[PDB]
Design a protein around this ligand. Sequence first.
Ligand code: QHO
Ligand code: K
Ligand code: K
Ligand code: ZN
Length: 354
Amino acid sequence: PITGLVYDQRMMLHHNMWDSHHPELPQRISRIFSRHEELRLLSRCHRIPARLATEEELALCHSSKHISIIKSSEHMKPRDLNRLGDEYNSIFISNESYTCALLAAGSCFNSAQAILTGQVRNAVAIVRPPGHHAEKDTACGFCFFNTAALTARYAQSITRESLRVLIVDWDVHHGNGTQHIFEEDDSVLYISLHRYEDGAFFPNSEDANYDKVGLGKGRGYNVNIPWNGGKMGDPEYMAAFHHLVMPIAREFAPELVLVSAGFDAARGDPLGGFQVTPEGYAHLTHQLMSLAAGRVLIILEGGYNLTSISESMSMCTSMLLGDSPPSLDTPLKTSATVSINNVLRAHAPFWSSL
Ligand SMILES: O=C(NO)c1cc(F)cc(F)c1F
Ligand SMILES: [K+]
Ligand SMILES: [K+]
Ligand SMILES: [Zn+2]
């Protein structure tokens, strides 16, 4: 009954040399780690070591051109770094970014391996830069390589190709890269909850709407839960889990659960505009541990209020360690019920539990 934790201070080296107060801060991960220390959660976990992902592992999801150009940024001059970052949507790059992205991915591989070999029951990965916006062939939205997508494919590579991986993405933004990587795949069920606002919210694409249910063999294996017109919080997320996430996940019967766990839907986030509480994230975590025989890996994505993400992620780890869920605090916003209803209608053909 062991919970793994991976954290390495080397991932703070990735930094924004033109805007040192950019919200994707090095101290995002040191703050979460520190909160684990001062809550005495760290000593209750088995520390899993970080490692660099290999280029061969990156190729599980990414093109050689993309891998090579990000790789080359390690030796780039400042002007090269500025111009390259400006080729992408919302990217900054420093000479340490490539290594930090490799460490984030390899940290999650070691954690998935420890779960799948039975050395830990579940695990938490306190990593940066994030991953879920990264596409096969491009960087995007503070993300270089798609850590969660790579971990899913790594998990299949050390078990069997068809290993059923559920990815729950509760970052407030749609994981466009993760959706696209698995859009034709029925072995990786992608479920995202996200602020959508009829396509106006970052990453600003109608790919995030509820009618994108997957393509080809993957039809039914892509579940978008888009929020419109409301400061969503614990009632809405709990409702979406009761009506959609958990029924669908149970029917899928994952053998491994990855959480793309951004904490930018948290109360206090400067960007998300939502009000999920730490106790809400604890309840979402507690529900997911009823799947996959408890084999859950929580991977840090976004989240920009250092206090909010530290409280929120620490509460998730508390839940992985087996602590009892804390009590919650409001009527469902009607527009949330509309969203849940749209998804139900779109996915009832694919999931008899709906
Ligand atoms: O946190 C984010 N995504 O998970 C994010 C937030 C923003 F405000 C702008 C971006 F480009 C992002 F990628
Ligand atoms: K999401
Ligand atoms: K899929
Ligand atoms: Zn985000």
